[PDB]
């Protein structure tokens, strides 16, 4: 009566650039819901809150900021929606997340250089996932994306170091590495054969990075 | 020509809420000015800027965040700094700072219950200052002092358990502990002392935590 449970199932997405996370999730969100299963669709970065807003403008650059600046905040936003997060796990209720702290590590180890270690501890101990789909495009591929060259990140050299920072992330037993370069509706099959792999079950949460 | 070396020295004031660290270096900026020595007053947190605005909301109670939400942004804080403080350093202009790191951790793990390396972590890298002056009172010494108690940790209960994580630093090279029960001129005195005790010459940059 005092439970203390996971009992939603919490899914990510991670990619490069314009690599199809929205497209994906989105469907995946619309399968679930027409199949009994509750869920909420999150998003990395969240742009409407205070540091939320910040990193917007970063990415947008409306602003500059320093390296380990920027990769504070991007942490930080994900630490101000735990409760929010673990709330709504408690309930039972999924969570799909658009980008999460490999986007955070990669990143920043990636495109500003930053060591990966260092780049990891302030993730620490936010909550783990039950899988990552890492939506796998080359960074040439990227490119003809509809709104290339916008935000601060997408030029084509920079996912290109990008990409081969994320393999520091292959290794994990919940990385699912899906070639992400088809038709939308291929990719999305293959999730859910995916997801209902998933047994459905109550469980103790756990914690990055272990 | 191509010159990275560190030509002023820069010094940190430590201390339990409201323990007299701004009238402290007021004092001693003032006197560096008139030994001819070039200075800078600065302090943590920074409450003017689009990240210190939500760490001023946060310490009034005006809004309130995750514990982990607000020790990145007293962090990023100070990142977003280093740039200034570098730049001012190189030139041979001395920065005296109203608290910094060591705040960060003394409070998080103390006031908040954070893991003291994971406290640390964010602020792993930043300018190591040459000497920091602690201004040590017993931790219910200062409740009757003008505002006291209008901001998050002025709580007696809650000095106690900083003041036994600052001790975390109390005995190390460049920790200078400081008897501030008494009448503010005889601890300025105190100060001066141990200032002019610097060597002045040029030096290799140093950075938290070594
Ligand atoms: C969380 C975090 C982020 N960042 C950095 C990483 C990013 O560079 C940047 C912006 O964050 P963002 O999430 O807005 O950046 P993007 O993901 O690039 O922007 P999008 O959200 O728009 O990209 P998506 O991956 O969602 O792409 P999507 O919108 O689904 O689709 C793009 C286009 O392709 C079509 N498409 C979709 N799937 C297709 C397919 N299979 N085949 C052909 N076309 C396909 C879509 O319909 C759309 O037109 O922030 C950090 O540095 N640190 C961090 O901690
Ligand atoms: C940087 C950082 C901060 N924090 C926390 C620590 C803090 O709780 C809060 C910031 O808050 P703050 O630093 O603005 O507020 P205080 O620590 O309380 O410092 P203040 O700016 O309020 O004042 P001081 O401590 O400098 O005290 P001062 O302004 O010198 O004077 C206090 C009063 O006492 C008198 N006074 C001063 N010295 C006296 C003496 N020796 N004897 C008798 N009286 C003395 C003065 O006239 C004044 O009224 O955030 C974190 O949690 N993490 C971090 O990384
Ligand atoms: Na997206
Ligand atoms: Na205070
Ligand atoms: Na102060």
Same mark, same amino acid.
């Given at each position: 009566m005092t439970?203390?449970?996971?009992?939603?199932?919490? #899914?990510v997405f991670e990619g490069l650039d314009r690599s199809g996370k929205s497209?994906?999730? =989105?469907?995946? !969100?619309?399968?679930? =819901?027409?199949?009994?299963? $509750?869920v909420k669709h999150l998003?990395?970065?969240? &742009?409407?809150?205070?540091?939320?807003?910040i990193i917007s403008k970063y990415l947008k650059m409306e602003n500059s900021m320093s390296n380990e600046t920027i990769h504070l905040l991007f942490s930080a936003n994900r630490w101000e929606?735990?409760? $929010?997060? =673990?709330?709504?796990?408690?309930?039972?209720?999924? !969570?799909?997340?658009? &980008?999460?702290?490999?986007s955070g590590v990669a990143y920043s180890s990636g495109a500003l250089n930053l060591n990966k270690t260092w780049c990891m501890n302030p993730d620490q101990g936010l909550i783990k996932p039950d899988v990552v789909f890492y939506l796998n495009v080359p960074p040439?591929?990227?490119?003809?994306?509809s709104d290339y060259?916008?935000? #601060?990140?997408?030029? !084509?050299?920079?996912?290109?170091?990008?990409?081969?920072?994320?393999?520091?992330?292959?290794?994990?037993?919940?990385w699912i590495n899906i070639d992400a370069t088809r038709k939308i509706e291929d990719i999305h099959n293959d999730i859910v054969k $995916?997801?209902? =792999?998933?047994k459905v079950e109550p469980e103790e949460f756990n914690f990055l990075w272990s």
């Open positions: 439970d203390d449970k996971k009992k939603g199932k919490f #899914i497209t994906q999730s =989105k469907l995946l !969100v619309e399968y679930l =819901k027409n199949n009994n299963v $509750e998003y990395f970065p969240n &742009r409407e809150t205070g540091i939320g807003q929606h735990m409760n $929010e997060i =673990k709330s709504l796990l408690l309930k039972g209720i999924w !969570v799909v997340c658009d &980008r999460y702290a490999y040439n591929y990227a490119q003809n994306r060259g916008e935000e #601060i990140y997408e030029k !084509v050299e920079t996912q290109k170091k990008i990409y081969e920072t994320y393999k520091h992330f292959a290794h994990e037993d919940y $995916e997801v209902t =792999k998933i």
